[PDB]
Protein backbone atom coordinates (compact mmCIF):
# COMPACT_ATOMS: atom_id res chain seq x y z
CA UNK A 1 0.00 0.00 0.00
CA UNK A 2 0.97 3.63 -0.35
CA UNK A 3 3.51 4.77 2.16
CA UNK A 4 4.00 8.25 3.51
CA UNK A 5 6.77 9.79 5.43
CA UNK A 6 6.03 11.78 8.60
CA UNK A 7 7.41 15.25 8.08
CA UNK A 8 6.73 16.37 11.68
CA UNK A 9 5.87 15.08 15.07
CA UNK A 10 2.12 14.88 15.64
CA UNK A 11 0.44 14.11 18.94
CA UNK A 12 -3.07 13.01 18.71
CA UNK A 13 -5.68 15.38 20.01
CA UNK A 14 -8.96 13.60 19.35
CA UNK A 15 -10.38 10.12 19.38
CA UNK A 16 -9.96 9.39 15.82
CA UNK A 17 -6.41 10.74 15.62
CA UNK A 18 -3.08 8.90 15.89
CA UNK A 19 0.31 10.06 17.08
CA UNK A 20 3.36 9.95 14.85
CA UNK A 21 7.04 11.04 14.97
CA UNK A 22 9.03 12.84 12.41
CA UNK A 23 10.63 10.28 10.06
CA UNK A 24 7.97 7.60 10.68
CA UNK A 25 7.04 5.59 7.58
CA UNK A 26 3.25 5.19 7.67
CA UNK A 27 0.87 3.14 5.58
CA UNK A 28 -1.71 5.40 3.91
CA UNK A 29 -5.27 4.05 4.44
CA UNK A 30 -7.42 6.78 3.00
CA UNK A 31 -6.54 10.08 1.50
CA UNK A 32 -9.96 11.18 0.21
CA UNK A 33 -10.14 14.16 2.67
CA UNK A 34 -8.01 17.13 1.77
CA UNK A 35 -7.04 17.91 5.25
CA UNK A 36 -6.95 14.71 7.25
CA UNK A 37 -5.46 11.40 6.14
CA UNK A 38 -6.09 8.02 7.70
CA UNK A 39 -2.88 6.06 8.29
CA UNK A 40 -1.49 3.08 10.16
CA UNK A 41 1.34 3.87 12.53
CA UNK A 42 2.98 0.70 13.27
CA UNK A 43 -0.03 -0.93 14.84
CA UNK A 44 -2.47 1.95 15.27
CA UNK A 45 -4.91 3.45 12.63
CA UNK A 46 -6.32 6.96 12.60
CA UNK A 47 -6.10 10.50 11.25
CA UNK A 48 -3.17 12.87 10.95
CA UNK A 49 -3.00 16.18 9.06
CA UNK A 50 -2.43 15.57 5.33
CA UNK A 51 0.07 18.37 5.37
CA UNK A 52 2.40 16.81 7.79
CA UNK A 53 2.97 13.79 5.55
CA UNK A 54 4.67 13.15 2.31
CA UNK A 55 3.56 10.44 -0.16
CA UNK A 56 6.37 8.03 -1.30
CA UNK A 57 5.19 6.49 -4.63
UniProtKB/Swiss-Prot annotation:
The chain holds residues 969 to 1025 of 2477 of the full protein. Like erythrocyte spectrin, the spectrin-like proteins are capable of forming dimers which can further associate to tetramers. Interacts with ACP1. Transmembrane segments: none annotated. It is found in: Cytoplasm, Cytoskeleton; Cytoplasm, Cell cortex. Residues 1-57 form the SH3 domain. Belongs to the spectrin family. Morphologically, spectrin-like proteins appear to be related to spectrin, showing a flexible rod-like structure. They can bind actin but seem to differ in their calmodulin-binding activity. In nonerythroid tissues, spectrins, in association with some other proteins, may play an important role in membrane organization. This is Spectrin alpha chain, non-erythrocytic 1.
Amino acid sequence: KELVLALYDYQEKSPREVTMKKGDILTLLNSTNKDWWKVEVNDRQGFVPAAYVKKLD
